[PDB]
Amino acid sequence: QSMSVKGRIYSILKQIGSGGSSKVFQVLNEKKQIYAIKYVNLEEADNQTLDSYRNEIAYLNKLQQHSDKIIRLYDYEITDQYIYMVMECGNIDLNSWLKKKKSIDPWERKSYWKNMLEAVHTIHQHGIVHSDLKPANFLIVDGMLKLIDFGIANQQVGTVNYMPPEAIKDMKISPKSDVWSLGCILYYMTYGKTPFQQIINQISKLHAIIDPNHEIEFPDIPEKDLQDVLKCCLKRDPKQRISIPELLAHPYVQIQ
Ligand SMILES: CC(C)CNc1nccn2c(-c3ccc(C(=O)NC4CC4)cc3)cnc12
Ligand code: NA
Ligand code: NA
Ligand code: NA
Ligand code: NA
Ligand code: NA
């Protein structure tokens, strides 16, 4: 099964992902280069939804040039019936890599954290706050992490483990919200779980996340600097929580 995008032909290799009206495929082109093509069927999409999709594509096309920690978009084809997006193919999502993982080299972790900050910093400079950041939003490629999306288009997902307190109360958003989520990610990568993963019940979990007397646990570890990043990222009050530009200057990423 071959498909054609902007005149060029790509042989399918396998499906990777799915969605309501979205499919992702690993493909090869004429020169045997490998890409991921996303196909979105628009038949059943509202004006607002189309508008959410066109916005994200304009943002990905643009932000590409400002960081290589953002996934590559090589080309796209868009009609009233479909979108095809030719994008960079990664090695594995960060969430899958993290699930099937014994522990992490401290060096690797630091380096993956740097990449997450860079990518999210980039979108914040352009006025985008992602607001639903999770391990699945990052992709490993050549031992680097790349951000795969910006949170803008409509519609493993559902999880609330990464959701900041002020997103629970509010149901405007600030970049401090992405810093909480990134923080839970690095908590996972440090202690092997998210900071509320124990609370199986959903409603106790949401009440634990917002309640200023539920003290989050920070077991001691050799890297005092990583312990500190985490505590600064997981402050419940956005105005106390560390900012991205601050995180970029923190001993944890700069020192050694
Ligand atoms: C082959 C597979 C096991 C590992 N690779 C991958 N796993 C999961 C997702 N992957 C992509 C991928 C890249 C981008 C998008 C995507 O939909 N981005 C939105 C901005 C428009 C969706 C999927 C590109 N490569 C992958
Ligand atoms: Na580390
Ligand atoms: Na998105
Ligand atoms: Na959370
Ligand atoms: Na959690
Ligand atoms: Na940092």
What does this protein look like?
With 256 residues, the chain is an alpha+beta fold. The chain has two domains: 3-91, Phosphorylase Kinase, domain 1 (2-Layer Sandwich), CATH 3.30.200.20; 92-256, Transferase(Phosphotransferase) domain 1 (Transferase(Phosphotransferase), domain 1, Orthogonal Bundle). Helix content is 36%, strand content 20%. It contains nine helices and nine strands. It has helices at residues 47-63, 94-99, 106-125, 166-169, 176-191, 202-210, 224-233, 244-248, 251-254, and strands at residues 2-5, 8-18, 22-28, 34-41, 73-78, 82-87, 92-93, 138-141, 144-147. The strands form two sheets. The protein has a six-stranded antiparallel sheet with strand order 1-2-3-4-6-5, with no helix packed on it. β1 (2-5) and β2 form a beta hairpin. The longest helix has 20 residues, at 106-125. One sodium ion is lined by residues 106, 109-110, 223, 226. The PDB classes it as transferase. Keywords: kinase, inhibitor, mitosis, Mps1, Joost Uitdehaag and Nicole Seegers 13021, Transferase.
Radius of gyration: 19 Å
| Alpha-carbon distance between the two ends | 50 Å
Structural class assignment: alpha+beta
CATH superfamily annotation of the largest domain: Transferase(Phosphotransferase) domain 1
Helix tally equals: 9
DSSP strand tally? 9
Compounds present?
the ligand CC(C)CNc1nccn2c(-c3ccc(C(=O)NC4CC4)cc3)cnc12, sodium ion
**What is the CATH architecture term of the largest domain?**
Orthogonal Bundle
CATH topology of the largest domain: Transferase(Phosphotransferase), domain 1
Oligomeric status: monomer
- Helical content stands at 25-40%
Number of domain units: 2
Keywords: Acetylation, ATP-binding, Kinase, Nucleotide-binding, Phosphoprotein, Serine/threonine-protein kinase, Transferase, Tyrosine-protein kinase
Protein name: Dual specificity protein kinase TTK
Family: Belongs to the protein kinase superfamily. Ser/Thr protein kinase family.
GO molecular function, one term: protein serine kinase activity
